[PDB]
Amino acid sequence: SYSSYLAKADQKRGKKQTARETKKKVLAERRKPLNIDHLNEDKLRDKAKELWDWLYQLQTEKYDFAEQIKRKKYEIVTLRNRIDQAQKHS
């Protein structure tokens, strides 16, 4: 089975490269430059925190997405045991 080796390259490289740009497209949208540079002095104040909240915003979400996979990862472990337990090739 070595004629399938060319399938690995094509496939993997393919999907992986597809995923990349998507991530880039996606992430790019959610990005508004720091255009506001030297337009006011107290502006920075009302600005800086807004950035701060956005960060905290994202941060908090990342934490949740995180804890979520963990919980799901456990859903799996169990869902796998139910699969084996429910084998009985009788």
Partner: protein, 141 residues
């Protein structure tokens, strides 16, 4: 002819309920404690901000944050994707079980609409007094 056997079963029940009852009270403990960890994690990774002087600092800091944003955001993204991957993995497993048993309890994805209790509250607001669950009602004396 095992006349007493009846009491044995009742025990298991008494215990089972002693178990669940234990579960529930432990369930909310882990829950809140969990949250605590969440606010501590966030406690250091993004502590109560303190705006600097002004001139260089506010600009600097702003640049600092803004860059971290693209950073955290990317991480947030990768995470979301590993989740997608995961939810995917269990959906397939949530299949390999269906067509091998059929409709089993506790599907991982759970398609749930809003509860009737929700709809009722949502529509009548104040006057919605029925802790509906299953308890039927037959005249009391």
């Amino acid at each position: 002819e095992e006349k007493k056997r009846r009491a044995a079963t009742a025990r298991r029940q008494h215990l089972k309920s002693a178990m669940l009852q234990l579960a529930v009270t432990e369930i909310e403990k882990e829950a809140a404690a969990k949250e605590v960890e969440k606010q501590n994690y966030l406690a250091e990774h993004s502590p109560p901000l303190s705006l600097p002087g002004s001139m260089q600092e506010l600009q600097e800091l702003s640049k600092k944050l803004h860059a971290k944003i693209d950073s955290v955001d990317e991480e947030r993204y990768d995470t979301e994707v590993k989740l997608q991957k995961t939810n995917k993995e269990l959906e397939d497993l949530s299949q390999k079980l269906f067509d091998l048993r059929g409709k089993f309890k506790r599907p991982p994805l759970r398609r749930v609409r809003m509860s009737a209790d929700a709809m009722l509250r949502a529509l009548l607001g104040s006057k919605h007094k029925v802790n509906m669950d299953l308890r039927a009602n037959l005249k009391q004396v």
